[PDB]
Design a protein around this nucleic acid. Sequence first.
DNA 1: CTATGAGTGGCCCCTGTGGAGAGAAGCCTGTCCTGGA
DNA 2: GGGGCCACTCATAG
RNA 3: CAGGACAGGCUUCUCUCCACAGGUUUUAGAGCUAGAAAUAGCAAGUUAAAAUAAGGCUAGUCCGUUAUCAACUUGAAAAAGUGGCACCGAGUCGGUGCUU
Length: 1171
Amino acid sequence: MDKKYSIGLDIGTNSVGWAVITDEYKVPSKKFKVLGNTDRHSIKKNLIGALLFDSGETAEATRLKRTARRRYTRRKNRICYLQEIFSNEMAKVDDSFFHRLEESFLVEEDKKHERHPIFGNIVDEVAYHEKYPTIYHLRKKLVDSTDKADLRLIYLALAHMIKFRGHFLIEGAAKNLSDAILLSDILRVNTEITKAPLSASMIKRYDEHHQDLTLLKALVRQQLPEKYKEIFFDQSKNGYAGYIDGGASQEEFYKFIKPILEKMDGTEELLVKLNREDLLRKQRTFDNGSIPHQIHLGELHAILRRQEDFYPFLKDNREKIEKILTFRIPYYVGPLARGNSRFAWMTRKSEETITPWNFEEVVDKGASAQSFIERMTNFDKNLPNEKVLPKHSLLYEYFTVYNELTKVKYVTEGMRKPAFLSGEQKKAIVDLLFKTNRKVTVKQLKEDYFKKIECFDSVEISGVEDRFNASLGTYHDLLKIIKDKDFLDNEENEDILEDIVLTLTLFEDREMIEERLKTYAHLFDDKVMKQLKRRRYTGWGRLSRKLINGIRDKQSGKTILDFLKSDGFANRNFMQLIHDDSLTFKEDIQKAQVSGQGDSLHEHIANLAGSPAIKKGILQTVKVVDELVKVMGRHKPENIVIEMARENQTTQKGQKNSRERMKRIEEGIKELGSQILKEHPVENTQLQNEKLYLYYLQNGRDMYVDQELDINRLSDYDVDHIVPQSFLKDDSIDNKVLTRSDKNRGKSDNVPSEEVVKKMKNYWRQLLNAKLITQRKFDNLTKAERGGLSELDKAGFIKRQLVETRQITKHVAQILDSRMNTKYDENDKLIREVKVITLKSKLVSDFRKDFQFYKVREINNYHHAHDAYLNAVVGTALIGRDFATVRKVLSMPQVNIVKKTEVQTGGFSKESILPKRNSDKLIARKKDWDPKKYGGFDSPTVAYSVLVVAKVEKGKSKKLKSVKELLGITIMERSSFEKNPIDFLEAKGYKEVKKDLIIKLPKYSLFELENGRKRMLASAGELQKGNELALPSKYVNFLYLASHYEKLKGSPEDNEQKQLFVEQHKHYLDEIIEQISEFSKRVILADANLDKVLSAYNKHRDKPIREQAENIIHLFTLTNLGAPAAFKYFDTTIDRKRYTSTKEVLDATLIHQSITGLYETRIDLSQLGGD
DNA sequence: CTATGAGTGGCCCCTGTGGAGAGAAGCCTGTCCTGGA
DNA sequence: GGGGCCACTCATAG
RNA sequence: CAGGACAGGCUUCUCUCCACAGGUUUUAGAGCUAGAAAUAGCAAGUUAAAAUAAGGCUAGUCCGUUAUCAACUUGAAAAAGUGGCACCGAGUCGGUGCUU
């Protein structure tokens, strides 16, 4: 007899809870059959549990890395092109020169020729490096002199130029002076005359650095002898040696040298330079990020112009060289892939290889742009075979206005029931008021159309309250451009103007927008064409031209747009028109609903919107529910599923923050009283852009440094996050702030310095009074006073996870409703055996709180399944003995807490590079670079592990020994291992392989040991805690109340009763401490740490209750699942215990756990490995 | 007399920005509409 | 947060 | 009860593509003098080349960190199938009965 049962689930980023209950709020218990060769044949499990899993990763890192690979590859390709163009000439003077350049990184033994790269002999190399201390000296000497030089010199020069060409941010009488001021900002020197002033500026820096170094050496040796060697010889310290020969930065060097100059007299000029960040500065600095590539282009032009008389090929290929330095892949064409890549959409005019000298000819740029723009366009929900139209299209805005005008019923004198506006009325109103005014209110219509044209002095309007929000913006702009209303009113130009708007919306560039309209050059004058070219439009709608005006109703021959213009007495709007059975439009909608191939559950789940983690979670959830319905006996439940929660906030504050952003910035400027607003016009559409919004927030003063802002400099200004990037991922505006480029590039993963905070706190306080900056934004400035980045600051819940845990309502809804019911009735109406029930967390939260079912996450991982069970019971209840039954249900220790096993994928190892050492644990960077001579990567990640039984040769005697040990397979070797395990094991050094004994052991492969102690295989040589502490509900409640001794929210009576319970049960602390000690001595085995914790507890017996409870909460980290984590107990700090022993699980028993852990196959190793 | 597993503590982790577009989700205001119970 | 590696010490087989 | 689009405003995030600066490692940049050597003293200190996941064949200025994954039988793979129930209790599940 099919019993009636329900299912409850709690969904999170990393967890999936599942629980099945009967009608009486009781979870059924079932005894199953276990597979394997073990003694135990039948075990009993309850029908509750949860599945833990890792968080899904966003693709941002992968996309950034892919862009990095393409960037590096194209850089090397440019280098290769330059090498090809010099190869024919260079081989005449030196054939092996490029061979030396390509083989610099090798050691002398591995090098084929002599170790000196440039000249090949020590004399000329030393002469080079003494004549030119830096490459910029060589650049300057070539650019200013008129003497023939060596081709190697110019090769090194141009190679340096091409590799670091510079930015493209700048495009394209007084303008010459402004350019000179721009260079003056760029270049520290102004007086010296030359065609390559960058070299002059940097050589100036070099000379002053050298002179100041000499002065410091002399004076320091004169006055302070003992610190001389530390400054100029101790590389380990943070002195000059660390600044140059060490890993120290410029700011660190300044910080360390400031006390030295403070204790030292005569440091006036040195302190002045240090306050200007202009002392002892290097060649390669973080300040070069603002260098425009135009300077490099001009210097290249000058050097080629000077050197062209010496070599014909230079003047023959100078245009090509300029192209290489200036060429760039258009941002809309995309990857230049010939079909094989899944990211490409470029169209090929021919089949030749794409080169920077023929890219324009070979690829259809217009078709490429159309393909790029069309990829991300949403398709019509009703006509999947048609595209949406630009939001600035005349037809779309006519749709908007007429739909707004469709439900404008008017009440007059001499009438009884409100009447729809006639089509003639609509047309007259539009032509008389909308074609003349950008914004129209109800007063305008009443006083200008009904009273003036219709002679209806008093008219009442229904369906419009404030005004007609929609506008003829594009129409009015085109009226200003063309000034021909007859052309606009002509219906034979509808297609012409539609393609005009389409072209204005598609292409962002100027050459394309000019080119495609060239066909229509016979319509208007040149000035109209130019102004149209200057015009731009962005955005797309949700409807299609075919629906509104393409298709015609068969019995009437009328379009939907025509119906909107005049629908008679009915005057249906868009929704009634699409939902009216009297027209074939609904039939066309139904027919166009293509019944495409049923997408696989992976495809349906993946085609959704959101992070990969949320679809991973929904896939896990559906797999779990499928397994539960399968095992139960293939009978469907009645009431199931989601808990989904929001905080809706109050409507008033959200509305008031939403309204008047433009007027909010205006009121802020008014409060400050600065004349900025009158200086520069303000527009809400401009406030939509982020950059101008930040500029107006700054009120002309930079946060970091005293500076006067500029409109043009806004392009050079860069937004930086005050909160460090890697420490915490945030793109919120309150975190974001505008600052000058040097300040942004100066600090990476660093909070602003304390001194800057001190000097700018006054202006920041004035901004806070102005209310332009939020309190959190002020706190990011204040974070320096807090002490910088800290552990507790990073331990903050990320908002994206919350967004997703709100986001997965509807998707679960339709997938359950779809797989749930695949059959219809005779009327084709769908009948449901199960109904999806959705509830918010507030109901179950008050259910917990009013009935003492509190929540502590850090006790153990039992809470997910408990919340799922509570969700089930509350969902059943909404649609005494029950509470007692729930109390018993939440008490069993036998809960199928199982973590899913994965094959680790991602990075091969850590990204850092370590110097060479005499060890075997390093990783070669290539197939031929021994880490002994070159270092390499370290700490490679392991993919999974196998248990290998074979014979190994031990000792110098090479005596074979039968062994049974596990060897970890890294991600570096997954393909090799899966390709041919036998050959791989033979090459490694294992002979007589027992292929049947290889067991695929991914991460978290749980191994069961003596006394119920369990361990998950963390890695090839690491283990993590496998058991969990079953804390009784009484201790849970007492601990939660003790932790909340002073912060209970409620009536005084209930709080006082809870306080009395807390104080009367003081002995519970000793009980839980002894329970933790017993659990440790049983499964954790942390005798040293256990003794430390017990000694600290005895020391702190008289401490206040709250601090004790907080510390007890800190203690469960030792007893929690997973890896151990460091924690602090009162004042005492306890280190982590790392299980680096892997000899013990070689004799234990494996248990493979099903997705819910109800079906398992226990396998004994002690029987395996027989000889 | 010397090498090597096994235990404990302390230590280390690549970064930053510009340009261009599209989409999605959330909140609010107004409009109306659609199917039900 | 959490796993990999080296400095230090130490028992045991060869 | 639920959904929709409209238009406006606000906030947040995702997805895809094009560029720029660094950073790290190895080597080149004659180190000198007293002293057999340890050592001592002195001199100099800015730069260059290469690499930036092993590599792969579909050979492209293409791709390589997203997604998927208990065990057994079948299938190359996708995929399909494979495993009893009722009652009483509870410290990692156990106790009783029926049939297989």
